[PDB]
């Protein structure tokens, strides 16, 4: 398991669509990624927290990937998260 605290760059308000791509991304990994953002911790492939994620600029979000491919999930997660603007 590894943590990734990300400093979001989006100020628009997260936008659920990018996060839905995160959903499908996390869905296809062995590892389960938890998204921890100030009270909101959720299975990242599950919208039960992610869809209402109130991240904006100062929001530092922490990802926890636990799996047989966790570090790999992390390295992919960072790429997609920066593509999706939930981190620099």
Residue ranges making up the domain that contains 60? 1-88
Tell me which method was used to determine the 3D structure: NMR
The number of distinct structural domains making up the chain is: 1
Cα separation of 76 and 81, whole Å? Answer: 8
Give the whole-angstrom CA distance, residue 66 versus residue 68: 7
Please say whether the beta carbons of 81 and 2 come within 8 A. no
**Residues designated catalytic:** 15
Q: Are 42 and 48 in contact (CB under 8 A)?
A: yes
Contact 59, 86 (CB under 8 A): no
The CATH number that applies at residue 41 is 3.30.1340.10
């Amino acid at each position: 398991m590894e943590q990734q605290s990300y400093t979001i760059i989006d100020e628009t308000g997260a936008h659920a669509r990018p996060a839905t791509m995160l959903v499908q991304t996390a869905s296809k990994f062995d590892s389960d990624i938890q998204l921890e953002y100030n009270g909101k911790k959720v299975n990242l492939k599950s919208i039960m927290g992610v869809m209402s994620l109130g991240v904006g600029k100062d929001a530092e979000i922490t990802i926890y990937a636990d799996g047989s491919d966790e570090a790999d999930a992390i390295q992919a997660i960072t790429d997609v998260l920066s593509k999706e603007g939930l981190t620099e």
